[PDB]
Amino acid sequence: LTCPECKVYPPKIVERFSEGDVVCALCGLVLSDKLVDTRSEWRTFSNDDHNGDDPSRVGEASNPLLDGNNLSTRIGKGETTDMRFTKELNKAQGKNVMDKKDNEVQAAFAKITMLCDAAELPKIVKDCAKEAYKLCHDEKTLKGKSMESIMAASILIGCRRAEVARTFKEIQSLIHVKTKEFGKTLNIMKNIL
Amino acid sequence: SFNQFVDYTLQDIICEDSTLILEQLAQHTTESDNISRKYEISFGKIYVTKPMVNESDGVTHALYPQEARLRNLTYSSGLFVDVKKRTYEAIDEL
Ligand SMILES: [Zn+2]
């Protein structure tokens, strides 16, 4: 936004949240009447509600950066439920699981998740290792590098950023590391911006 | 109640189901076949360290309640179990 009335290059405009307006500090003109509490709005997607009682909790958060655009809902046993239908419907979802070579490469994330928990590594490290891997796995710069060592290299790339200290020898023992190979794969990815 | 759970209860839970076995019996055709095996994973004594914290940088040290409250940490202590992996074999009972 910018004030029509005045218009001096740097627009000195204030958000008077409690009064619910976006105002021009210089002239006094209210530029917007509709204002939302962002923090309280975010609390309808992410909340204390696991029960499903909350009329406020109406949405669900997602990680575009990692999950991409995959919106899905579990078919599960509710209060009244004949197990027959839950099986039938889930059996049906199985036949409809004809996902791509990369929509099946999200199983490489399931590997990193199993490798981080085993390495006693934090959630942020996974979300960094799963990030660096999702960006370098398809790369020509990496080509036919030992696939087992490429994802182990992204675990060190994740650990370096999240300040969680882990030795190359530690990650080397965690999966299986061909020292020269997982040192070369950790450099092509490091070169990949 | 908590003390009873730690000193006793905890061990009996680690011993109820405890042991898990997987048996790989062959097709009994001829070598590489006619080899029946059974592998064991066993749960022994349960050990419980005094409370500790595993910092960002490797270092695991003793965590005191004030520290726990102030750095928003969990006043937890480590659980350790003696696990034994036994292996057995038979041809085409023993
Ligand atoms: Zn103005």
Side-chain angles (χ1 to χ4, degrees), chain A residues 1-11 13-33 35-78 80-90 92-99 102-103 105-110 112-119 121-139 144 146-147 150-159 161-162 164-169 171-173 175-179 181 183 185 187-189 192-193, chain B residues 1-26 32 35-91:
Chain A
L1 281 135
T2 296
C3 186
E5 277 235 311
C6 17
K7 262 165 213 172
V8 295
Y9 180 79
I13 69 102
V14 263
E15 192 173 317
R16 304 294 312 191
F17 179 85
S18 22
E19 304 87 76
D21 296 4
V22 170
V23 180
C24 169
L26 318 116
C27 90
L29 171 70
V30 26
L31 289 6
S32 178
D33 55 78
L35 210 123
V36 291
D37 187 317
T38 356
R39 205 248 265 92
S40 86
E41 224 68 41
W42 177 258
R43 279 213 292 104
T44 53
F45 298 100
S46 275
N47 208 9
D48 273 291
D49 197 35
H50 291 273
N51 179 23
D53 248 58
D54 196 16
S56 285
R57 180 86 186 271
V58 98
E60 187 77 275
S62 21
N63 185 178
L65 235 151
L66 290 174
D67 108 87
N69 18 227
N70 289 267
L71 315 205
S72 346
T73 80
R74 285 151 36 81
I75 307 146
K77 176 204 163 66
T80 164
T81 282
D82 177 3
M83 268 48 84
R84 194 224 315 181
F85 311 123
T86 329
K87 290 150 197 166
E88 276 188 11
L89 280 150
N90 276 292
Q93 255 305 333
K95 315 279 180 190
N96 294 169
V97 171
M98 64 264 289
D99 292 34
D102 191 61
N103 299 194
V105 140
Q106 47 67 44
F109 282 172
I112 301 162
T113 342
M114 226 166 279
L115 252 107
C116 287
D117 296 7
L121 249 31
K123 199 249 184 193
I124 204 271
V125 161
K126 314 192 206 181
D127 306 352
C128 278
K130 289 180 198 141
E131 193 175 333
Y133 165 86
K134 204 214 175 174
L135 303 156
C136 288
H137 90 123
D138 203 35
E139 281 296 315
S146 314
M147 219 276 193
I150 114 277
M151 65 117 155
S154 54
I155 281 167
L156 193 141
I157 300 292
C159 282
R161 107 75 47 154
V164 173
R166 294 295 150 151
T167 62
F168 187 71
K169 212 172 95 177
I171 319 153
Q172 177 160 268
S173 44
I175 182 72
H176 85 82
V177 149
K178 325 267 181 171
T179 321
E181 148 64 65
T185 191
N187 210 303
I188 104 281
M189 288 173 144
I192 297 154
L193 267 301
Chain B
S1 191
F2 179 82
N3 276 328
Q4 172 64 39
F5 167 77
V6 181
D7 311 323
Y8 310 88
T9 319
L10 200 81
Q11 184 70 65
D12 291 67
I13 295 162
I14 238 88
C15 291
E16 59 172 281
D17 43 302
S18 61
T19 50
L20 42 139
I21 72 99
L22 179 68
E23 40 111 50
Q24 245 59 258
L25 280 46
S32 187
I35 303 156
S36 310
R37 302 205 177 176
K38 299 214 177 183
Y39 323 108
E40 283 200 45
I41 273 186
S42 317
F43 299 108
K45 201 184 216 170
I46 191 155
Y47 294 66
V48 56
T49 47
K50 276 241 172 186
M52 281 112 59
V53 131
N54 223 297
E55 254 229 303
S56 60
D57 63 297
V59 292
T60 324
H61 74 110
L63 152 82
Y64 278 116
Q66 214 40 63
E67 182 147 37
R69 298 179 229 272
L70 300 191
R71 315 185 44 219
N72 297 130
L73 311 170
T74 308
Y75 194 62
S76 63
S77 78
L79 232 72
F80 289 82
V81 163
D82 298 324
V83 199
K84 198 178 234 74
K85 204 176 293 229
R86 305 312 218 176
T87 293
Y88 303 90
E89 202 186 306
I91 307 151

